Design an enzyme around this catalytic site. Structure first.
Site: not given
Ligand SMILES: NC(=O)c1ccc[n+]([C@@H]2O[C@H](COP(=O)([O-])OP(=O)(O)OC[C@H]3O[C@@H](n4cnc5c(N)ncnc54)[C@H](O)[C@@H]3O)[C@@H](O)[C@H]2O)c1
Ligand SMILES: NC(=O)c1ccc[n+]([C@@H]2O[C@H](COP(=O)([O-])OP(=O)(O)OC[C@H]3O[C@@H](n4cnc5c(N)ncnc54)[C@H](O)[C@@H]3O)[C@@H](O)[C@H]2O)c1
Lengths: 325, 332
Positions: A236, A265, A291
């Site tokens: 994000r 966004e 995106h």
């Molecule tokens: N660009 C895109 O099209 C796209 C596609 C898929 C996901 N995403 C985004 O990617 C992000 C991550 O997705 P995900 O499914 O891997 O999430 P997830 O919940 O599976 O994993 C998140 C990870 O981040 C860690 N985390 C949380 N807070 C933290 C902090 N303060 N410091 C260090 N680590 C921390 C958690 O411990 C976990 O390991 C989401 O916000 C999602 O919106 C974007």
């Protein structure tokens, strides 16, 4: 025939699939329509297919009293008031996680494209200036580099999976530690956050946007990086302070920034930026995508089919397979 | 009297220092490439030459440089160097067998993803200032569930297969020699015929040397076989493909795209080589190009230069260079 509003362009197959069962009010353009225009269309609708730019709150639902289902072509909760949905007897459905894999693929493409100066390289050949091999145009590869992941959930793991066999030293910091057997399988070592930014040649972001992760990647963390360090953001926009990134680039401390996502966004924030800074957009040490993390045809078709099948279940009177409420 | 060493392109200071004790250095520490004419003039009385990608050595070249003992090439594909003519003149030719492999493999895969995901156009859109949020645009082809076909399965072919291990693709290859069963099993590689490879693959990644048998191998006939939308990636040599046929296949929309680090215009040993890349290919939207930067990583280039320097020293010291391509008479 129950009325269905589809807020964004879908594959024709999806229209072919739904038309026998639903009267279709479609948006077969590239544009996102105004909230006023969506409300107008949905007033007497029995169903909606919603996409990422759609925002569903209590007010929206009250203005659509005939709505029985919102089938979302997405997986995130942020834009949709789940509790208000149930409270007004509306089914809210999401899709299974088909988005992680194409995003992880793109993130690694962005790392290689950023490290090897692909934008400028391609521009050079396209211009007609290429007259043979020259001893310059140097870049940084992944072999023997230290790759640091900030976060290690779904996309963190998908990216680490795809870097197996690239000869890199993998490290991560996350709020939740990986189990020992996963760490050993993937060759991942857990490090502190300050240490991750101090010691990584590539920093790949893999964390969600929370109140606590807002602007986590700030001037203080960026000041720690090795000169020439590369930062990749497929998550994000707002986990990063884009002002601080730009300053780190212009200083020459940060070697590059690649991003699929932008602060502008993230609509919930009162003083979110209204655009991407033109000076960031003009900086040579960057690589951007609009995106398009999940923008793989087969994936987008399957997401839409899932949404469509969920809508048909709800309209036939049964509980949809991917009901979130 | 130290042997004179002509180095056709800029080299790192550290390599100049390793060679200076044993050689008088005739250097080109500019960014530019010198003419044929200029190189021949410098090599007229040279004992050794360190050559690079732009260099071409034929019988006529060697005839005019009779004191040459060795040509150390800082590259792997020595298609522009006439090996047999070198041997006939008692000149060692050496190459660099492994060091270029990995950064070229990394690049090839970055090109595959960039091409399949419409990165050039996507980036241009964001830079235009017109991004407002997600749109149902730029839908492309990913590696997950795709059939990936390799043409050739040597060092670069294997390095790419290695790097695709966690990507969920179906890997197949065509080569002159099959890999042993154990390697196929480990990397999930299935051997297929060439036309089979072209008919079935979502991505076609080239990993072949340029020789008489591979010259225009990827021609109109093979390209007429591709599944509409197929993506072709060329990190090896331009002339392995017929660029005219590739453009034609893009223009009819059968080939979904072409990415390339190398171009026909670089293949000097061809009499009939194109003098440029066709402006219509350069202007085509379904492309992604890089200017022969396969191995352009500073730390790698230093080791490449070093390998070439070491081979040249071995030859000049009167031994068999470890990476000699040819064989000369030696006292038993
Ligand atoms: N660009 C895109 O099209 C796209 C596609 C898929 C996901 N995403 C985004 O990617 C992000 C991550 O997705 P995900 O499914 O891997 O999430 P997830 O919940 O599976 O994993 C998140 C990870 O981040 C860690 N985390 C949380 N807070 C933290 C902090 N303060 N410091 C260090 N680590 C921390 C958690 O411990 C976990 O390991 C989401 O916000 C999602 O919106 C974007
Ligand atoms: N872009 C760059 O900077 C860069 C860097 C390194 C190498 N290269 C080029 O890429 C080529 C391949 O490099 P490599 O290190 O993999 O070479 P390699 O010699 O290790 O392997 C080449 C493979 O191609 C196969 N082959 C030869 N002719 C064939 C044919 N007619 N049909 C099917 N297979 C055939 C051989 O069996 C061999 O397995 C080099 O010769 C060089 O021209 C380019």
């Amino acid at each position: 025939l129950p009325k269905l509003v589809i807020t964004h362009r879908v594959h024709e197959e999806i229209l072919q699939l739904l038309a026998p069962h639903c009267e279709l009010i479609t948006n077969q353009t590239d544009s996102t329509l105004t909230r006023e225009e969506i409300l107008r269309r949905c007033r007497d609708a029995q169903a909606m297919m919603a996409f990422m730019p759609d925002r569903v709150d209590a007010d929206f639902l009250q203005a659509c009293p005939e709505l029985r289902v919102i089938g979302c072509a997405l997986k995130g909760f942020d834009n949709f008031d789940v509790d208000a949905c149930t409270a007004r007897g509306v089914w809210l459905t999401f899709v299974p996680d088909l988005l992680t894999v194409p995003t992880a693929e793109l993130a690694i493409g962005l790392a290689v494209g950023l490290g090897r100066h692909l934008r400028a390289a391609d521009a050079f050949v396209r211009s007609g200036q290429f007259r043979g091999w020259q001893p310059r145009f140097y870049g940084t590869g992944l072999d023997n580099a230290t790759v640091g992941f900030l976060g290690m959930g779904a996309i963190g793991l998908a990216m680490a999976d795809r870097l197996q066999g690239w000869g890199a030293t993998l490290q991560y910091h996350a709020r939740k530690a990986l189990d020992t057997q996963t760490e050993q399988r993937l060759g991942l070592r857990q490090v502190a956050c300050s240490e991750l930014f101090a010691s990584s040649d590539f920093i790949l972001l893999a964390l969600p946007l929370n109140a606590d992760t807002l602007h986590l990647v700030n001037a203080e963390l960026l000041a720690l990086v090795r000169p020439g360090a590369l930062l990749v953001n497929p998550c994000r926009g707002s986990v990063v302070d884009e002002a601080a990134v730009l300053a780190a680039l212009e200083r020459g401390q940060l070697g590059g920034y690649a991003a699929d996502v932008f602060e502008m966004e993230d609509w919930a924030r009162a003083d979110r930026p209204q655009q991407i800074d033109p000076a960031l957009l003009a900086h040579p040490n960057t690589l951007f995508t609009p995106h398009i993390g999940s923008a793989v045809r087969a994936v987008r078709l399957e997401i839409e089919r899932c949404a469509a099948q969920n809508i048909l279940q709800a309209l036939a009177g049964e509980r949809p397979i991917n009901a979130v409420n």
